[PDB]
Design a binder for this molecule. Structure first.
Ligand SMILES: Nc1nc2c(ncn2[C@@H]2O[C@H](COP(=O)(O)OP(=O)(O)O)[C@@H](O)[C@H]2O)c(=O)[nH]1
Ligand SMILES: Nc1nc2c(ncn2[C@@H]2O[C@H](COP(=O)(O)OP(=O)(O)O)[C@@H](O)[C@H]2O)c(=O)[nH]1
Ligand SMILES: C[N+](C)(C)[C@@H](Cc1c[nH]c(=S)[nH]1)C(=O)O
Ligand SMILES: C[N+](C)(C)[C@@H](Cc1c[nH]c(=S)[nH]1)C(=O)O
Lengths: 425, 429, 424, 429
């Protein structure tokens, strides 16, 4: 009576790796053995089942060898990776009604077939593509469905999504209210609040699946001053100036990252040099800096090795996250973590999950989204004594360890799911 | 800037009539001319448009002469009735994804085509089958969509039935809830206290997106006339009622999946009620209730396709103890309102289940008897009606009649909807 | 490279048994050991996988014990039964687009999961509910899909629902498009019909021909003692030569033709129609009296009593007079149970009926008029006892040769294995 | 009994114009008055109704002034233009199941709403997106459906593309093929020899359900006028053409996931064609063609959003050796007919892929050069054009122009459609 399975239903991560869902799957597999050991102590024998839509080898980001490494990793542990029919051509990984409906039907199939051979199943489904899985299983699965707890995560349609997304998320919201076995896995304090209010999700049906980073990954290593300086040598940084760093996607219609707010505020920050690394070159930001006579360094297509060096440089005053609400950005967590010994302190807008990340001012600086507010937040960082920066840097590093550690947060999900199984049963 | 159209998207009401939606269409057509006069005082020239799915002549409740009268009534006033494609047989006024999707698309079409030839449109869509209309119009209709205020109304997917709503119902009502919070031009018309609280608590719809469309009856309709004792006995003489016993009356659409009208509860309770004769009038014959009555050895009069003249007489007869309404989760049933009103002088008192809108109708017990949905509770409710003091029987009858006048008057409630829609339109401009 | 699986995708037959698909599943499992033996000698180790939509225990025909038996039968043989999500409540076993789409998606999933652990798969899918399975596997399954041969069987739309038309049009497209997609025809009639109606290439038509399990006890030869014992309660006249018909009542757009025999009996002195319908038929009563025809009209009769009727030396013929049906097995049953005595078969010239009676060599073909029926009966009466011997033997041999379930499921397996080799 | 409507259900042609369907709508409207006169002689009074899916102003090819012109053109003749709900954003004239199902439902609605006010309707539906309209009308429309003859036409799901048609395309065209066989009132309008043979061989459609709707051009349109050498040079002068080299011209909608126009095949072949300059004018700019030309070091001139005046000049210039049409499976392309006609005096000869309707257009080699769809064959085809004797070049140019006159004249071919539909209408009655 102790065979426990986690079924991870993910739109990418094995055959294809091209975004945040795939990173989640990879950190998951790195944590599998530790999670197995942890749950053995609670008396469960854990296996992992991974479900991913069939991809065509010509899909963007397809990697036959990554698929093979995933399959071997899970098989070596008595788990399995299963490619799922999605009534599609295999080139995308997203779609409309037909894609969502078929992939949810076969994701549900995988859950029930896993329930057939196990004693208990935690089905962790992600995105609108799998949002119908809980209702399909719980409506039709009979005694097998009563072995399953669903945790559906990674976004509910927010108030323009497609009709397919609206309907699928409306379906999972219905089933979360309807069934004791359907929970929403919230990725942040912000989405837990949003979904309770927006979808009338009951508190008892909200379960933590909180976004985090894998703190021990090599890409987060602390760098020496010597290595920092040789990595940033080709970035064209000025010999003088305190850097305030931002990076990410270019601002877009409906996606204001707020880079312009730093450039505007830098007008009133003598000795501050904005350093902004966008996905692609940004002529608009160049024209804005030239108009304001602000000496910004504007980079593009920078690798994280180089952002980390920038963030760690003693010349770097802060890292700024000034964008509109996002539910689960991990970039500010990466900044607080790689700067654990030197460099940036974090300035965060009061939107989305950012206040939670900087602990509402205890591990970083919160600002409203205006140039004057951002200017005042920058000089609040400059005003800190060396000792005060040391305390806030330590607080930010501790906050990542305490709240945004991937190993702890997936353990938190598993414990909550196992606890909820017992309570429902 | 004066041509205002109400577009009513209704799953029945002209070719087909079986339940409350069709009664609603009859009610608004009877009130249309008065509504036109009233809205003209508020500065609008009002036209009515009715969209109903094409039906096959084999459909239950089909009457092509009713379709003729409705189409001609509307045409004589410059309005129109329009039969709507729903990608189906036409043999049923419900369906799944294909039915909902095609009907919402063509209902959306009718809205936008009306918007193109008018200055403003109030699009009143009813039930999950049309719940996607607001989103289809507002997503794709461009400038024509900006002339429309949506009011989506009537029954919806809920957590209050043992039968789980279909995926199509769940998706559609999720879609319209999304659009109430996404669009200034998408409101829901609550038909009852029960649906209003459901919109806020289940669907998280903001209070500003709620508009009144409260279930009600046309009190002055001749079919609600008080009857003489002679005319009562005349009408019930051909119903096969036993010479002895007191009647508990029920009527309505047959129970079906997703629609538990609770007739079986009265039959069950009647084997503990020795002098009680259930009288159950369903739209269609119902062999299933006959098997239940037989199985229980319950003497019950099971009727079908009864005209309201005969139901009214049954409700007013001194031989009738009660009329019972035992639906699992009525969103906004008007039949208990009809009983309270037609019995204002004599006859039945109302027994109502403690679910859906029924407690609001009987004023939580001041205007009728509230019962849990079990055979033992229903039997105890019949006994409660029997044991009332004379003063309490008179008081409850008067209170029920007064509640219909104050809360469930169709002329008042449809004017409330229309005044709220005209105000909301002014707000969004 | 020797692991072969047959994946049978069926809307019923384990959790639920109500119609012909369930009977097919039951006869197939009885034949599994023989098929395994037969295919082992062709170099294949054979596993059976059964996929059926999840049913609720309240579904009509639900039997938890039949489900357990099928489960044990397949597990004992290294196979499995798999219940399939169909995005439905589990009460029906049929539905619309949502049901067809989900059930085909998970049917396709079961095929591909089977292909992952085997070397070759024959995916036998049935009815419009699984008709999208070949397309979903072959469009998206990659290298796993190239291990699969699809045989889609049990009906193409020939007024069906939009969902049936679309699903069957999809599989027709895929049968033309893909070397790995075949249509399993159940009769000579449907093989011709699908070639003409759906432009199915000849190389994509594969036999899955309807048949009966000849050796089932329900087809046992009865002594005259047992025959007379079983028909004693049927209210048969002391005199008269019977012409027997049985099956469903005639319904709108599905005329079984019972009235044609009653009308023809007006011109058949000494012939007594015996008609056993599913439910009582007051219309047939009204019509027998109108014509002063002495008919025996029965309802709800078990095959034990039908078989006794068909075997009685008093029975002249069994008649099958309805409009086109693609794969009726009732006339095969009549030809088989009368192999030693009783009825010879009269068949309308519709659907699979001419094939069944070998176009007159194993029975009497008739046009669907009362005069033709009466004439057909006269021809049966005219036959000498030696000609009746000839035709009864031809009819029994025809069932053994063409309508034997064990042979026809072997014929399917051999055709699919040959097709597999040819595609590689 | 004289009121006849043609309902044209078109995925583009008013709000949006990019390809052949929109060109057909334009040709049709210009020919409307002559069709009305001609059908008046056969006893019918004819109205045109146009249905096109709602588009957002951001859709490619959108022009609000074109929409207004079409709407006024039809209104002035007592007809109408109707934008149709398709349950989509309006950013694209295609989609999957949702788009197909909603647009077919509202197309069917427009057909039936037209049948209610007319005596007879010819419903011309185009492409897979409307292929379910005949079945939707005929299944559910009752007496109104009995006034309609359906003619379904244009591109469809085939086995002739490397990209497999989508499930929605396969289902919809399977559905119209079924209804063609099931209903006397459902025909398909073949636009080419290729689609006629495909209807019969792929979809088993009976020959009596096929009516002609053969792709054609309005030869007398001013845009097909012969140009002087001076006017040719003035129009080509602003296109950035190199001083030296002979041109091979292509133009059309950009290639897209289910639409391989073969532009890349010409750029490929040009690596083996030292004196040849490809000139490719796509509706939209096309970064990918520039990357391919750069990768191949081919000095192609890549144009976008060119007016037909300038394409005509390119095609007539003696510097132009050929116009190439290299689509994978054109159901009925008219662009080769435009080249054959406008170059009747000078300029291009036509190179046509050996697939789709293209071999029929060039009379299997008598009116142009047929090529297999490979780079090596396309380059061979260009060389074959160069090596023609003077007599054969002259003869081919004349044969090409004569073929358009004889087989691809729009005024004759749209009259042929209308006469065949009117004949078919009489037979079903
Ligand atoms: N005359 C008659 N009217 C009926 C019958 N069944 C239902 N109705 C009417 O149909 C309407 C039912 O509406 P409601 O009580 O709101 O329930 P709904 O049918 O579930 O919407 C009422 O006006 C009933 O009086 C019947 O058998 N005979
Ligand atoms: N002026 C102009 N017309 C174009 C362009 N691209 C396509 N067309 C016209 O659009 C129509 C294309 O129709 P056709 O050749 O049948 O191909 P389809 O687009 O695949 O239907 C023809 O009339 C073309 O001349 C362009 O870039 N400029
Ligand atoms: C099918 N259904 C969901 C059970 C509803 C549909 C409906 C009809 N009237 C109203 S309100 N809703 C019903 O019939 O009550
Ligand atoms: C999307 N599609 C199937 C590739 C077609 C649709 C179409 C547009 N015009 C015609 S004809 N068919 C196309 O764009 O050519």
């Amino acid at each position: 009576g102790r065979a426990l399975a986690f079924v991870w239903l993910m739109v990418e991560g094995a055959q294809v790796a091209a975004g945040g869902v795939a990173g989640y799957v990879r950190n998951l597999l790195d944590e599998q053995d530790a999670l197995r050991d942890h749950l053995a102590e609670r008396g469960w024998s854990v296996e992992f089942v991974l479900g991913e839509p069939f991809y065509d080898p010509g899909a963007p980001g397809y990697d036959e060898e990554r698929w093979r490494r995933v399959r071997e990793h899970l098989a070596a542990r008595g788990g399995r990776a299963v490619r799922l029919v999605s009534d599609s051509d295999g080139l995308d990984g997203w779609g409309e009604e037909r894609f969502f409906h078929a992939l949810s039907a076969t994701g549900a199939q995988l859950v029930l077939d896993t329930a057939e051979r196990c004693d208990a199943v935690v089905a962790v489904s992600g995105t609108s593509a799998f949002a119908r899985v809980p209702g399909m299983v719980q409506r039709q699965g009979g005694e097998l469905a009563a072995k399953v707890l669903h945790v559906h995560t990674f976004g509910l349609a927010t108030h323009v999504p497609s009709p397919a997304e609206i309907a699928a998320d409306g379906d999972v919201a219905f089933w979360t209210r309807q069934s004791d076995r359907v929970s929403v896995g919230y990725i942040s304090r912000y989405t837990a609040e949003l979904y309770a209010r927006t979808y009338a999700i009951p508190a008892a049906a909200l379960l933590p699946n909180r976004s985090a980073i894998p703190r021990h990954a090599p890409r987060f290593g602390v760098l020496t001053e010597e290595r920092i300086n040789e990595r940033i040598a080709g970035l064209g940084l000025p010999a003088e100036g305190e850097f305030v760093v931002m990076w990410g996607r270019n601002s877009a219609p409906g996606l204001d990252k707020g880079y312009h707010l730093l450039l505007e505020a830098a007008r009133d920050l003598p000795g501050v040099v904005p350093v902004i690394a966008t996905r692609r070159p940004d002529p608009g930001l160049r024209r804005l800096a030239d108009r304001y006579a602000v000496p910004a360094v504007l980079l593009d297509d920078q690798p994280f090795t180089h952002l980390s060096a920038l963030l760690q440089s003693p010349r770097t005053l802060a890292a700024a996250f000034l964008g509109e609400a996002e539910p689960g950005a991990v970039s500010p967590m990466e900044a607080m973590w790689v700067a654990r010994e030197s460099g940036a302190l974090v300035i965060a807008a009061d939107t989305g999950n950012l206040p939670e990340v900087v602990d509402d001012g205890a591990a970083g600086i919160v600002t409203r989204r205006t140039a004057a507010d951002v200017a005042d937040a920058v000089r609040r960082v400059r005003k800190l004594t060396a000792d005060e920066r040391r305390r806030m840097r330590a607080a930010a590093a501790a906050r990542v360890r305490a709240r945004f550690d991937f190993a702890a947060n997936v353990r938190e999900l598993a414990d909550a799911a196992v606890d909820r199984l017992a309570e429902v049963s």
